[PDB]
Amino acid sequence: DFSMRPGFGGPAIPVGVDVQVESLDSISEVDMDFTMTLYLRHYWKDERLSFPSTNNLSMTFDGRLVKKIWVPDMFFVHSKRSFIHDTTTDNVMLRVQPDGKVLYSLRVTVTAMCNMDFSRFPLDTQTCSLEIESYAYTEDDLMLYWKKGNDSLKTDERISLSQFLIQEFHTTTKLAFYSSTGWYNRLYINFTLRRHIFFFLLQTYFPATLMVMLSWVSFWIDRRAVPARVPLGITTVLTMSTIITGVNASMPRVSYIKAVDIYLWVSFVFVFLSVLEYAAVNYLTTVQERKEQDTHAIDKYSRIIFPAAYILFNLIYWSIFS
Amino acid sequence: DFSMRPGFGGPAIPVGVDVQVESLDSISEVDMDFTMTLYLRHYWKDERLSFPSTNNLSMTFDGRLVKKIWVPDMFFVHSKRSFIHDTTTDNVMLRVQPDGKVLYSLRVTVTAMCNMDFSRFPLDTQTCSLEIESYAYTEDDLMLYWKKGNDSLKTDERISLSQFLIQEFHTTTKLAFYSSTGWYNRLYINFTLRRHIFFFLLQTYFPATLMVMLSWVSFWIDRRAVPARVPLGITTVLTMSTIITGVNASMPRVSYIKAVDIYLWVSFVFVFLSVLEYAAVNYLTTVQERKEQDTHAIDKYSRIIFPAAYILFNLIYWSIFS
Amino acid sequence: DFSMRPGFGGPAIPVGVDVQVESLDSISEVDMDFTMTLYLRHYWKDERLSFPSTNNLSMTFDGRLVKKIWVPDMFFVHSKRSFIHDTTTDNVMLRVQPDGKVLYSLRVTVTAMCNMDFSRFPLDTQTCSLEIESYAYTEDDLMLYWKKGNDSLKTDERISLSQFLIQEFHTTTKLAFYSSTGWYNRLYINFTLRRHIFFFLLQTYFPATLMVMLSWVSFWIDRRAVPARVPLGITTVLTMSTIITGVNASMPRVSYIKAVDIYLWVSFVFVFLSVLEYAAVNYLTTVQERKEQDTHAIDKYSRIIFPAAYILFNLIYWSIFS
Amino acid sequence: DFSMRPGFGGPAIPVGVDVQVESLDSISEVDMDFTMTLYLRHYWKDERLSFPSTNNLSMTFDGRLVKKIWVPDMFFVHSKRSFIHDTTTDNVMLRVQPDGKVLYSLRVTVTAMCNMDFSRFPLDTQTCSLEIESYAYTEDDLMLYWKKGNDSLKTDERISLSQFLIQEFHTTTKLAFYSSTGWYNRLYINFTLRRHIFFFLLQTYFPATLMVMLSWVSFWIDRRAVPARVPLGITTVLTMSTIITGVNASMPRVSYIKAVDIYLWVSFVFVFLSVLEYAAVNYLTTVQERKEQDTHAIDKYSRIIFPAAYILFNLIYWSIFS
Amino acid sequence: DFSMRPGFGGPAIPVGVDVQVESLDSISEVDMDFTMTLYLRHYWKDERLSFPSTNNLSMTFDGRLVKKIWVPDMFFVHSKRSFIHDTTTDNVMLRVQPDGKVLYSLRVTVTAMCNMDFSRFPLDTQTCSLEIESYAYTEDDLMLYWKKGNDSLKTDERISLSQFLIQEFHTTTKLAFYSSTGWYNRLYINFTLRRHIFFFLLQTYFPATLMVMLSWVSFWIDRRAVPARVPLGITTVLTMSTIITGVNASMPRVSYIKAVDIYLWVSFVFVFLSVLEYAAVNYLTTVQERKEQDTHAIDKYSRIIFPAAYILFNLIYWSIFS
Ligand SMILES: C[C@]12CC[C@@H]3c4ccc(O)cc4CC[C@H]3[C@@H]1CC[C@@H]2O
Ligand SMILES: C[C@]12CC[C@@H]3c4ccc(O)cc4CC[C@H]3[C@@H]1CC[C@@H]2O
Ligand SMILES: C[C@]12CC[C@@H]3c4ccc(O)cc4CC[C@H]3[C@@H]1CC[C@@H]2O
Ligand SMILES: C[C@]12CC[C@@H]3c4ccc(O)cc4CC[C@H]3[C@@H]1CC[C@@H]2O
Ligand SMILES: C[C@]12CC[C@@H]3c4ccc(O)cc4CC[C@H]3[C@@H]1CC[C@@H]2O
Ligand SMILES: *[C@@H]1O[C@H](CO)[C@@H](O)[C@H](O)[C@H]1NC(C)=O
Ligand SMILES: *[C@@H]1O[C@H](CO)[C@@H](O)[C@H](O)[C@H]1NC(C)=O
Ligand SMILES: *[C@@H]1O[C@H](CO)[C@@H](O)[C@H](O)[C@H]1NC(C)=O
Ligand SMILES: *[C@@H]1O[C@H](CO)[C@@H](O)[C@H](O)[C@H]1NC(C)=O
Ligand SMILES: *[C@@H]1O[C@H](CO)[C@@H](O)[C@H](O)[C@H]1NC(C)=O
Ligand SMILES: CCCCCCCC
Ligand SMILES: CCCCCCCC
Ligand SMILES: CCCCCCCC
Ligand SMILES: CCCCCCCC
Ligand SMILES: CCCCCCCC
Ligand SMILES: CCCCCCCC
Ligand SMILES: CCCCCCCC
Ligand SMILES: CCCCCCCC
Ligand SMILES: CCCCCCCC
Ligand SMILES: CCCCCCCC
Ligand SMILES: CCCCCCCC
Ligand SMILES: CCCCCCCC
Ligand SMILES: CCCCCCCC
Ligand SMILES: CCCCCCCC
Ligand SMILES: CCCCCCCC
Ligand SMILES: CCCCCCCC
Ligand SMILES: CCCCCCCC
Ligand SMILES: CCCCCCCC
Ligand SMILES: CCCCCCCC
Ligand SMILES: CCCCCCCC
Ligand SMILES: CCCCCC
Ligand SMILES: CCCCCC
Ligand SMILES: CCCCCC
Ligand SMILES: CCCCCC
Ligand SMILES: CCCCCC
Ligand SMILES: [Cl-]
Structure with missing residues (x-):
């Protein structure tokens, strides 16, 4: 039953995250938000997916399989709108090893909220972040972490804005609480902005x-x-x-x-x-x-x-x- | 037949609502509306869903099951447009207890209508609300109420607008009538707005x-x-x-x-x-x-x-x- | 075969319409159109839907059945764009009596065309209308009428615009002709607009x-x-x-x-x-x-x-x- | 196999077109395009669809059948965006005769490109057109023509623009060539524009x-x-x-x-x-x-x-x- | 299993690309992007698709088959948004030869990023490009090349902008590296822009x-x-x-x-x-x-x-x- 997670009813599944940023696309000062485009990658092990081959090498599969198997359910906290690209077909990749070790990858665009203070305009400096969390499963069922610590964020060479200067990309983590539902793990990407x-x-x-x-x-x-x-x-x-x-x-x-x-x-x-x-x-x-x-x-x-x-x-x- | 409600043909099913507000996103003075983003939660019991386990603890299921079972049908009265978030997958959660007690949760954004009077501009004060109602079933089939009275609304700490000051969140209820269809129960969230x-x-x-x-x-x-x-x-x-x-x-x-x-x-x-x-x-x-x-x-x-x-x-x- | 209408190959089916207006939402003077949101209701009898029960009372069904049975096909003449609301689920209702008498209801938003003349601006007065027609079937197969004559339009109490004054809601009917396809029945809703x-x-x-x-x-x-x-x-x-x-x-x-x-x-x-x-x-x-x-x-x-x-x-x- | 055209592997199928214009909706001078809304009608014969009845009269079917049978594949050349209307259901009609003669009809809105020259502004005059072509099949498989010559275009009585005067609607045809794919037949609708x-x-x-x-x-x-x-x-x-x-x-x-x-x-x-x-x-x-x-x-x-x-x-x- | 590529587990499949440009549609100087509309064509051989016929000629099939067979997965690098046209049906073509040689064709619109420098405004000159890459398969599984070298780009005769002058269309290729996933082949289309x-x-x-x-x-x-x-x-x-x-x-x-x-x-x-x-x-x-x-x-x-x-x-x- 792929309607249940690996180790369902036992301890929690470790899942590891890796990210590469393609572009920042736009900024609204009136609405206090920004738009970003990225690749997002996931890693986990599921023995139900193991197969008998001697190659010791991964096999690439189309995105048709993703609707059949079990897969994480991350979402973007404090987003206004997002989507996954689909031309000429779904921008989805699945790689599986004879062990049942899986790699899963997406391309997405997100608009996210960032509270700004303009009282020192035009001498202000702003700092924003993007937040990632699991929707359904709590820290008792799913453990979420950066796959390589500080090295799990990559950023593209040709990023720029016609109105702003970008600096200081780094990542961190925090544990968060909802009153009706429980405790969850949360990952962050942070950066700073300045003017001319x-x-x-x-x-x-x-x-x-x-x-x-x-x-x-x-x-x-x-x-x-x-x-x-x-x-x-x-x-x-x-x-x-x-x-x-x-x-x-x-x-x-x-x-x-x-x-x-x-x-x-x-x-x-x-x-x-x-x-x-x-x-x-x-x-x-x-x-x-x-x-x-x-x-x-x-x-x-x-x-x-x-x-x-x-x-x-x-x-x-x-x-x-x- | 999950095409019929629990107790179909007998008395009405009690359903209880809980809400947490994420952000107010924008306001239009010309069009007289606002946009809001929230989590919405439902509670009910359905013995058809009961299962034999000793754990006395809830089990989390993916959103694939929601298209198979029976589920409420609330909608937003006096809305212009709304939607449910779907990246990286549907923002839907289902939790079920061995008893058949269910919890069901969604993340959504709504644009709603609020009549404003600007004759005292810029010395005006405005008050708006969000209204929730069941579409198909009348108070003879479904009973709708706040799950914990006054404690069933939570509001996020970092809410703010670049043009307005927000105060006075509270909830209430009212009974409403359509001439061709019947009587229904309605829930309200209210708040106030002011300028600088x-x-x-x-x-x-x-x-x-x-x-x-x-x-x-x-x-x-x-x-x-x-x-x-x-x-x-x-x-x-x-x-x-x-x-x-x-x-x-x-x-x-x-x-x-x-x-x-x-x-x-x-x-x-x-x-x-x-x-x-x-x-x-x-x-x-x-x-x-x-x-x-x-x-x-x-x-x-x-x-x-x-x-x-x-x-x-x-x-x-x-x-x-x- | 629900791919054929009631009385298929014999006389025409009578279908009766009822409407309630929720709001007028916006107006464009440049593009010469308006936007409106309403409830739309249909009535007919289909003995294929009759069921053996003593209750003499209607039963409410979810919108899953609408894709299985036969249903009218009304559309909005001289519209630019429209849609049916779908949060948290499709805003659709179906009620059926042991007789096979059916009631069918929708919530929708429509943008419609209204030719305006501004030569007396700002002393002009404009009049617009919304038109309803059956797409596929002609007056030889489907008969369309207001279910209660002049009493089949209801209008909400809190309707208003920030730029206009609204008056004079009434309904009427007319018979219309296409050269390549035939004769059809058409229903109208009319109203008037004025300025400050x-x-x-x-x-x-x-x-x-x-x-x-x-x-x-x-x-x-x-x-x-x-x-x-x-x-x-x-x-x-x-x-x-x-x-x-x-x-x-x-x-x-x-x-x-x-x-x-x-x-x-x-x-x-x-x-x-x-x-x-x-x-x-x-x-x-x-x-x-x-x-x-x-x-x-x-x-x-x-x-x-x-x-x-x-x-x-x-x-x-x-x-x-x- | 309705995955193959009538006379598949033999000579070409004749298909005849008829059009009625509902409105011109908007114009962009910066982007050099216009938007139009119309009805589009097709005619052909397919003996696979013939049925034994004495009536000598056509039968109307819902749009569910269109996904089962074979149907032409026309598209709009030099369009930027288009769509088919779908409220309260798909604006599609199918009529079939005992012979296997078919009539097929759609309602659509199209935005199309029109190169303009403003060097004589405000004393300029512009001329635009809408182009129709078959996507997959070449003149060796499908023959495309106006069903009644010059009489195959109808135009609505209440068409107008708030910024322009419209005159001179007529139709014509031309044969067109792609280097990697072949020869095709193309139909045109032309008109002229002027100012105040x-x-x-x-x-x-x-x-x-x-x-x-x-x-x-x-x-x-x-x-x-x-x-x-x-x-x-x-x-x-x-x-x-x-x-x-x-x-x-x-x-x-x-x-x-x-x-x-x-x-x-x-x-x-x-x-x-x-x-x-x-x-x-x-x-x-x-x-x-x-x-x-x-x-x-x-x-x-x-x-x-x-x-x-x-x-x-x-x-x-x-x-x-x- | 059409869930695996031709020669799955052996050497790489050669795939050849051909392009024809329909229009450039708009440009944003603030957001630093442009919009383009084109036809895109692919060529490869798959013996699983071979069929016994003497004709030595290709057969045209509808786009229903594309969801059944295996097909490449190209995508547009550094795009903000794109889509495939679908009126009156999907703008997709499939042609297959008795050998199993395939031709596959699409019509699409893309918005792509182009970094601009305005410091010499209004005496500036800008150069932009469109980039094509395979999403899932690396150069060890798929080989991507222009089908006819320099002759694989065609451009339409009536292309123009109301604010710019376009010149110097040509194509090239480059090999690209992602740190977590591997090496890929990339194709480019380049052009130049100037003002009045x-x-x-x-x-x-x-x-x-x-x-x-x-x-x-x-x-x-x-x-x-x-x-x-x-x-x-x-x-x-x-x-x-x-x-x-x-x-x-x-x-x-x-x-x-x-x-x-x-x-x-x-x-x-x-x-x-x-x-x-x-x-x-x-x-x-x-x-x-x-x-x-x-x-x-x-x-x-x-x-x-x-x-x-x-x-x-x-x-x-x-x-x-x-
Ligand atoms: C400096 C001006 C006010 C501030 C404006 C602004 C303000 C904020 C911002 O992000 C960009 C710009 C660009 C145009 C600027 C204007 C150009 C002339 C005007 O005085
Ligand atoms: C005060 C001004 C008129 C009112 C304007 C307004 C009016 C309403 C509102 O919600 C915001 C603003 C911001 C900009 C304001 C303007 C800036 C200069 C102008 O005089
Ligand atoms: C009266 C003015 C011209 C007409 C404008 C108009 C014109 C038409 C309309 O529907 C609304 C408005 C509001 C703002 C008005 C303007 C405010 C100042 C200006 O002179
Ligand atoms: C004539 C003006 C310039 C040209 C403008 C135009 C220019 C082109 C067009 O299609 C419409 C209009 C309407 C408003 C016009 C303006 C109103 C005052 C201004 O001088
Ligand atoms: C030249 C002006 C500033 C620059 C403006 C511009 C600037 C950039 C551009 O791509 C187009 C235009 C058109 C309108 C131009 C303006 C018209 C009058 C103004 O002085
Ligand atoms: C990979 O598989 C080979 C057998 O093909 C084995 O000899 C080798 O040790 C394996 N390496 C790892 C890192 O598992
Ligand atoms: C929960 O289940 C246990 C049995 O595992 C039982 O002893 C206990 O009373 C139950 N508690 C409640 C509140 O139902
Ligand atoms: C309704 O049904 C009851 C039987 O339950 C019958 O006695 C009564 O006459 C019916 N009324 C109508 C209006 O059909
Ligand atoms: C129509 O059918 C009738 C038989 O019902 C036949 O007598 C008549 O000739 C037919 N007319 C045409 C035009 O086919
Ligand atoms: C095409 O097929 C014919 C047989 O019908 C054969 O004689 C001819 O050589 C073939 N040509 C090519 C280029 O394959
Ligand atoms: C918050 C202090 C504002 C002072 C404004 C003075 C303008 C002359
Ligand atoms: C003799 C009185 C002179 C005052 C000058 C004040 C200048 C601000
Ligand atoms: C502000 C102008 C002062 C000019 C003084 C000239 C003295 C030589
Ligand atoms: C009053 C400050 C003026 C600064 C001008 C700077 C020009 C580069
Ligand atoms: C409603 C009273 C308006 C008075 C305007 C007076 C302008 C001089
Ligand atoms: C001698 C008549 C004086 C009037 C002054 C009026 C000032 C408003
Ligand atoms: C409005 C200026 C009045 C100046 C009066 C000065 C008296 C010493
Ligand atoms: C006439 C009222 C002026 C108020 C100015 C306030 C500046 C903070
Ligand atoms: C249609 C008559 C317009 C007259 C304009 C006169 C302007 C002085
Ligand atoms: C002596 C000739 C006077 C003319 C006055 C005209 C005023 C419009
Ligand atoms: C337009 C000003 C006329 C003033 C006349 C005063 C006569 C006492
Ligand atoms: C010339 C007409 C002026 C009317 C002013 C009305 C102020 C309420
Ligand atoms: C193309 C000729 C332009 C002449 C402009 C003259 C402005 C004084
Ligand atoms: C005595 C020389 C007069 C020149 C006048 C020129 C007017 C353009
Ligand atoms: C441009 C004004 C000329 C006035 C001349 C008057 C001669 C009687
Ligand atoms: C210089 C030409 C003026 C024309 C005015 C026309 C007014 C209707
Ligand atoms: C980068 C040099 C700017 C100089 C501006 C001078 C304005 C007087
Ligand atoms: C006698 C001193 C003259 C100085 C002129 C300066 C002009 C910029
Ligand atoms: C800038 C005007 C100078 C005029 C000089 C005329 C000498 C004859
Ligand atoms: C100072 C340069 C002016 C150039 C004008 C060109 C008119 C076509
Ligand atoms: C002597 C009075 C001076 C006033 C300056 C504003
Ligand atoms: C004496 C006349 C005074 C007029 C002031 C407006
Ligand atoms: C005597 C000439 C008067 C002119 C007024 C415009
Ligand atoms: C005599 C010089 C006249 C100059 C006019 C511009
Ligand atoms: C003699 C002083 C001249 C000043 C010019 C700005
Ligand atoms: Cl000004």
């Missing part, structure tokens, strides 16, 4: 800084030139609003406050202050003309105070986000 | 307020400076229109009026009034020059009246939406 | 009107102030172009002219005329200065003529679209 | 023309008014750039130069020239003041030259694209 | 250049005209920011720095310098007036220095990217 920071600098931090620097030119123009100092400020506000809106229309739509938001809105406030300043100056000059009938003090103080405050802001900000 | 309000404040309410404050600077500039007071107002109109359009291009495209729309358009009207004001002043000054051949009264009244009206608006608005 | 008009007013008609009103302020400023009257007009053109582009980027991309387009472009022409007007005035004043070496007539006529023409435009436009 | 040109005119050509006309107003303003003639030109450049960007953000993303691109960029150059012109005038006036210590010649020539060149441009352009 | 460069020039490089040229007009306007020289520069900054944002909103979202980015941001810096320049001039003139109570030197130097630097920039840039 200079791209984001050039695209986001650089224009805003130039705009704040442009708002400081106003302190050096003659206060008598009202039709020249009034349009400059409000046009500068317009430009900065355009820039911020542009950045908002292309972000990955996660709805909480991130490191880059703070920089942008602080720059906005600096430009806004620059526009209240000249109103101060104009009003005071005008009342002086009225009262009676050279650079203003607030101009020559602003020329020092504004840049120094911006420099202090930058020091603190990059002390916090490093 | 400070994000939306900073992104939407803050720029508009700054713009209205910028429009009030005009009352303090000398009415004699026409080429300075005329471009300021119309450029301010341009900036506010840009801001409103930016917000309109990223909203979730539900076509009725919401709490935030009102704020934005009232700010627009304030900026517009500021531009009619100086036209009043300019015209009256000009006719006075003509008639004959110091701050104007309408300027020094506007400096008080405009901010006070905006303050009244804010008081009422936040008394209504709280 | 105030949303569209506030978002589209209101800003444009305010802009046209802003362009009329120019007639009251002193013609001597050239650097004040020249930038006002061209900035107003810029603002109106921004607004029109914003509306164009969010419409449902159907490529013919609609009711709202006309309003927007007529407003554009009014703003454009306002800018040619002052050029007239400036040139004539300048040649008068040259010739020789108070409000201009064209100013004080424009102050009357422009608003009156806009009022006439609005009267005609809302007489046409009502 | 006034929509595109109003949305694209009209604003740009108005902007060029606005740039010519500058030649009539007094050269002494520098703060009035300088901002006008650069604001006009800004407006035209906004318009061009708006059009670029909604086009179907095919990356080569089209008829409308040329118009837009030529208008851009005209506006740019207008801004160099006044610089000429200002500089020359200023050096004259310096040298010494009425309308300028370049103004009164520009007033003639610019519009005439634009008129020449339009004549040539519409002589080329008609 | 003039489109990208006109859309991106041309406007920016015109804007830089517009910023140089300021050096020729009279330094006394402050309300004319101040708004020109800041409006020019606004226009250039709009242009850059427009380009950023339509690029294929790969997050590293490319050839075109550099040009755009260098143009931005040139426009920014032009605005600091006049501030220099204004301040120095003003202090001279104060000190005491003709073209400035910095103006007449800028008129030479700015264009020469831009010309040097262009020379170096196009020496690097050619």
